[PDB]
Design a protein around this ligand. Structure first.
Ligand SMILES: Cc1cc2nc3c(=O)[nH]c(=O)nc-3n(C[C@H](O)[C@H](O)[C@H](O)COP(=O)(O)OP(=O)(O)OC[C@H]3O[C@@H](n4cnc5c(N)ncnc54)[C@H](O)[C@@H]3O)c2cc1C
Lengths: 494, 504, 503, 494
């Protein structure tokens, strides 16, 4: 008879685990507890702050929500209108001196006329092949070429995805992209050549403020965050998890949102360790740069970088998302360096206003990253891409490296996962999440939050885990049926 | 305030309604009651019996379950191994004097060689067209021709489906058939022709189970028994006459008023519109097309003839018999007809003539069930259909002229098939959201009018998922994504979920 | 009978002169060539206005498929100053623009919204071509498969109706060649993206045109090389009866000519009437043809910068009755009077009277128009000249103020033999019947096949007919136009081995 | 001033040269002479006879004539109805104990059912690919597969053509087969499977070589020079002078050379042409004749094809069916030389007949050597293996001759080489034409070859297009009725 006993134990309090917790706390049936080694909920969707006052999200922001359930939980956490800012859902690709709007292929009119020809010629090839295709694409690279043609593949999606995933497009599967047939809309691309939706963001606290607020709604006594909640052993057969302080938790069902390879190690289950080690992943460097001045003459989006004049694959003007992402203009800060690398003339603390850039650089066994120099190379890439002038004054830098950044959709991934996840299922273990179940396409915040919700919904109410197994299905519909108040709660308060 | 008040009211105790009730009784959260105008549970899945002792179900589509939850409800209702019999899925198409194993195209080797050429030539055209196809078929007929080619479509699926739906294949949609691409397996069809082979899509893995006693209606009697009796109201006392959508009240024949917070109505949606005195819905429901179905049962004296054998359902595209499908109902269970020692007089011979003797002789007996469909595009003479069917049994060589008939059965069901017309979804996407906005889950074979989810396992789950949506926010998968549920193993919803284990 | 020869040739247009050049080369069997016209060249002749302006019957310049044709022209006009060389410069007049030919490669000149419609149609065409497994059955189908709907509607469809005076749906398409009917989508979209214009001419895309006499000067020169005594042109050479069974032709003056083989280049419907063969007449009357109006306009002034080096122009739009126009004054400076020649202005292009009736000097330039007429598309003979001149103002070829000093209008009853769907069905009944009576009916209207009806093909029709009559040669041009067009026909020369070995 | 002077000199009196001679003699214009090293005209279309009285053609027989001109010359040469026999145009393929009528694919119902399945399945694959084909086949093997599919290719056309050409189907071009699109008639092949379901004339006497002796009789004797007196040893292209073995020098104005073009290059001492001709590939051919005692075994007057590898020959014919004058009459007495199984006969005595006769062809090349010392025996064994001879049949005559230049190989390289050779010879006023004069097998049978010489003369004199040489597809697809042995030119001269 161990130290604590619960029906469902939730390991991890990132969006996946908090999803499971929100649903367990709504159903309010089986007993439950959620643990996390971090004192602050949010996992990799947390927000850091530099000593100089600049916020940087670790794990991006949602630009589209697929579930009314997710929406209800956000509204509960942040219910006032000035808890949120609304911006347009846009993005750009940096290509040959130009900021090319999304979607790239629909905007190549911005590139030189000679290069437009190369693109259309490639897409005509693709359109003609698609017309007699009778097989589905087998690799990511095949999917790209069949969709965009050689010309448009080489300018953007091919070189870009190598910088993101640190594997060639030929070594990745493509089912994760959807069931949309891989063929081009040739008429759309040429018509635009010839002729020449919002998201909400937290006003305060960055993205990680959402998850603090969502977690606040949980009963504190059913949570255990910090060093007291680090899981060190998992005894699958005794249904016992052991914590670092020696506390033992017994469960009837386990929702594990830690990385499945870490789970395999904590089970001292060498069969699973062997299998998990077959999974490929890339590590992520998040770099933040705080700059003195006003914003460069734009809007609140992500920027993509296929070219090899900067080490990062994506950048954002994080200061455009919210004015509380960086210090107020009256705050005094010394200039740390110039964008060109030189030391400033004066050690004087001057006022702002300030703006802020965030970068991501990926690292893997096939793509090393010089930890000692990457910050400077990024800042240089910011000068090369004309995001920073050589003379801009940098007042804050941020650089953190996350070992498990992206779960890589390799060709082998599904083969390995259908050996890992059913084995854990048979031991009554729902290993779910960005790295709990290792599927990038459902690894952003709304899908992940719902992986936890649906996992609990499967454990209690016999629901199909739709997001886990049918991302295509959930992405192609309005998910309105599951709500933070279902009929069950309405009929019980009578 | 009204006479009775419940959270979820279920109108109708056919499989859909029993599904809704089975899940309400499992969850055991919100209060509920289920009503029906018939004293016997099962709706149109009931079983009739002739005065002579022959059982007849309402149709010849046996049960195939897509859901572990359906299995659990059956296993609970009839748990002993000898409550069920297991048979192989054996069916044939009757074509040009031959019983052609199903699927038809895999067995055209039984037809004349000149006809084999026309069939293969048609399927070659279809395969070549399939190779450069870039559109979906828009009509049921296009789907058939793309699947089989002209020759094979004309021998079976075209003439047969007219006899089934009583509308032409060109006036029906085809999404209800699935997302499988409409293309032929030319190599399979030519290979069997070359080898001269026949082969059916059955074998020991391809089975179905049938209730040992009571026919199909016995399943639903057993399922309904598992409900708490006090939460039911069946018979004349449970006939619904008014449904006041805005006051959320249903009124019964005897004047009892039931107040509901949410309503699961499994009656035919056109009658529901009448019972709401809602002239907008009545106009819309009157746009829905449906066919009426005649069930004919014929009881025959003798041991089972070799020409019949272990056959189960039979398909009839040709115009020498009024029925589209026949069933050897006596093969499904020995309790579907009287025992051999039972004595019965011969009523007539298959050719219509009087029997030599009016005295009752012993059996054994066997039993055939026929289905005939009727519509404004294909009328049916109620006064003669029984005799024309019996003649059709002779024309198709199911009965010899001298076979002795000891029992006949004929019932006509006004709402038989909800027709998958081209117009159906356009009308249905106007009707269902309106009923949903009034908190009405109109579900079922005619509650939601979608044939492809209107047999027993789908319909049972329509009610289960409708409740699951009302209480637990589950997606109504069977209602809106039939292709999705049919193409997967639905093992997650079970009659004992975590919720019930954690409460005990 | 009065005269007897082995091979008689009726007509001295290009086909018959071809027959004669080869008969005169072989110099074996006896022969004579007759024509009702005193001037050789038939309908490839050249007219001249009283004011000194030359006008040909057409706007299709000469492109030779045969070294043999080349040898015969060179013999007739051998000095370098007998010919002028120009680049093949042509445009389509469409929506205020002179669009370089080929039309589809230049739609960048049209409004963008219209470019989108054209490219969208051609994408549809390219994708259908990718899975096509039938040949086009009609001219219209061939156009659409080549261009898509948009580009077909802007040019080839409306234009060919003005040309043939029947719809593109009523015409066959085998005569255009065996080139598969599919679009060059990359070429068309590349030019749209680049904003490029590009015509199908250059330094080596040329044609040569006679310095003097117009086109009809070639055939005068060619005919001169024949033995005069073996020709009989004028009223003395009009054929009125043809007795196929006695192999006798009767002339207007009553001379009876007996032949062993006959090469007839008169219109086959006229031949059938002249044979008093009611079976052939019935069949020939099944053949469709359009009549062609030629209008010539002589203009005062130096060549306008807007006209430039243009040669032929195509007119699909319905603001002018003509389908084609030619800057005939660019082909040769001797096609119109010299600058010192004085001519009064007859009218202004807008129809108004000139200020002065006095004769002023030039220089001059010259336009030739072609308008077609048929039972499905009539032509008001009394007004077509004015309507043409109005069409010159509408198409911005003439300013309202331009001074017209000469006009020409002639109407040729047999203008184009129409490639109808019915043509081969009827022709494969006519030609074998005439062949069985030893009659080689050949030519633009002798054999009625438009695609071998311009000057080089017709010339060779007569050459090959003689070569078939004498040497067993295959009549390749007659029955396999595609074959001769796709190759260099270098084997037959004006001096073969036979003539080298005999001298 | 050389020994003789002619306008057109014709080297060779096989069918091509005789064609050249017949037309020159018809035109009767330029002077001319024809020479041949053999005293008997006919070249490799000649007929040999064994000491025992059995005739064997070397170079087969024409089964279809494409030209009324060819017909006119045969009718002139052999004008009586009893100079010819008429037989039906048919052939069979020997495949797995069966004689499968031509065309093979239309008769696969004779094979075991499972093999019909493999054939139809392969042809279904070809039918579906042809539906989206947009390229022409580049190799013979590609042409076969696209036409017949894998199953039927492997049973007949693939192994058979290796035995014929003695090079693989992958190393040969396919333009020589015609311009008929390479696609299967799937309905015809399956219809015959489901249902279970045109003459030539042959010389009465002298075998095929009698045609050419008779044709050669029509030339003026003084204008011919056959035998050792007419062997050409030197060809001086620049002096337009040919020198013979007896030292006679012939001056020409135009030269029609029908000897093998590689031999022509040697005789010109032209190392540029020698190098070029040596690039051309050819196979050597063994003709084997077997004379048998007995009546004909249970019969049609055709060729038999042998794709299987239980006999070394690729085709065989019952030559005794073509004419009773191809073998001795029954009253002639001949000893048995051997039995078909190889053993010595019981009796050495000369017995009466009747007799019948088999002819075989075996191909040899650098890629497929042949044992000269055993090939006759191996052939006789192959006749037993294919049940054409019973082990006990009595063989009374054997014939074995090897022709070094047998077939000009339609290799992938051939047209590249030929368009370097034929223009060089054309520029020296040399019309090199024929089976080996111009090396194009598809016009190397008797009627095409005869016309190559006719058309070459017709080009030299009358400016006619050499249609057969350059456009085999064109002439094969039409009735060539225009050129006749009496043209208008001769009619108008009398
Ligand atoms: C309107 C028109 C426009 C053309 N435009 C072009 C062009 O742009 N480019 C081009 O290359 N070609 C053009 N041609 C065709 C060109 O002229 C041909 O080379 C030629 O006309 C066709 O050859 P032919 O010899 O059959 O022609 P024809 O000129 O028809 O020759 C027939 C001759 O026979 C004579 N004849 C007829 N009946 C009798 C009789 N009963 N007795 C005696 N003699 C008789 C005629 O008078 C005439 O001289 C055009 C033709 C026409 C009609």
């Amino acid at each position: 008879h161990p130290d604590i006993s619960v029906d469902v134990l939730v390991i991890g309090a990132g969006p996946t685990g908090l999803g499971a917790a929100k649903r367990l706390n709504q159903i309010d049936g089986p007993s439950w507890m959620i643990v996390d080694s971090n004192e602050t909920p949010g996992g990799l969707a947390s927000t850091d702050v530099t000593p100089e006052g600049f916020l940087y999200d670790v794990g991006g922001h949602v630009i589209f929500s697929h579930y009314k359930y997710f929406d209800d939980c956000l509204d509960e956490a942040l219910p006032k209108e000035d808890d949120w800012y609304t911006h347009q859902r846009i993005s750009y690709v940096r290509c040959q001196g130009q900021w090319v709007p999304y979607p790239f292929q629909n905007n190549i009119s911005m590139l030189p006329k000679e290069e437009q020809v190369k693109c259309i010629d490639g897409m005509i090839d693709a359109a003609l092949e698609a017309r007699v295709a009778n097989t589905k694409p087998k690799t990511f690279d095949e999917w790209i070429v069949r969709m965009m043609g050689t010309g448009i593949a080489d300018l953007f999606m091919r070189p870009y995805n190598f910088k993101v995933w640190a594997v060639p497009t030929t070594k990745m599967q493509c089912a994760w992209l959807g069931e949309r047939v891989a063929a081009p809309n040739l008429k759309a691309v040429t018509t635009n050549v010839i002729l020449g939706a919002t998201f909400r963001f937290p006003a305060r606290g960055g993205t990680g403020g959402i998850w603090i607020a969502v977690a606040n709604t949980l009963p504190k006594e059913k949570t255990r965050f910090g060093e007291k909640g680090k899981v060190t052993k998992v005894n699958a057969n005794n249904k016992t998890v052991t914590l670092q302080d020696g506390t033992t938790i017994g469960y009837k069902k386990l929702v594990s949102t830690m990385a499945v390879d870490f789970l395999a190690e904590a089970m001292n289950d060498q069969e699973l360790v062997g299998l998990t080690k077959q999974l490929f992943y890339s590590s992520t460097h998040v770099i933040g740069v705080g700059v003195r001045g006003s914003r460069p003459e734009g809007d609140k989006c992500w920027l993509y970088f296929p070219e090899d004049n900067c080490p990062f694959y994506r950048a954002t003007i994080f200061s455009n998302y919210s004015p509380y992402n960086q210090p107020e203009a009256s705050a005094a800060l010394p200039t740390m360096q110039l964008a060109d690398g030189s030391r400033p003339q004066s050690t004087e603390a001057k006022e702002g206003p300030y703006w802020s850039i965030m970068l991501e650089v990926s690292e893997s066994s096939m793509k090393p990253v010089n930890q000692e120099t990457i910050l400077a190379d990024c800042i240089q890439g910011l000068v090369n891409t004309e995001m920073l002038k050589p003379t801009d004054e940098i007042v804050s830098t941020y650089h953190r490296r996350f070992d498990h950044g992206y779960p890589t959709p390799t060709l082998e991934r599904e083969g390995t996962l259908t050996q890992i996840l059913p084995k854990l299922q048979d031991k009554d273990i729902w290993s779910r999440g960005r790295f709990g179940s290792w599927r990038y396409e459902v690894g952003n915040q709304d899908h992940s939050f719902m992986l936890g919700v649906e996992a609990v919904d499967n454990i209690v109410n016999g629901a199909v885990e739709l997001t886990l197994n049918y991302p295509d299905f959930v992405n192609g519909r309005q998910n309105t049926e599951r709500r933070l108040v279902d009929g069950a709660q309405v009929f019980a308060k009578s």
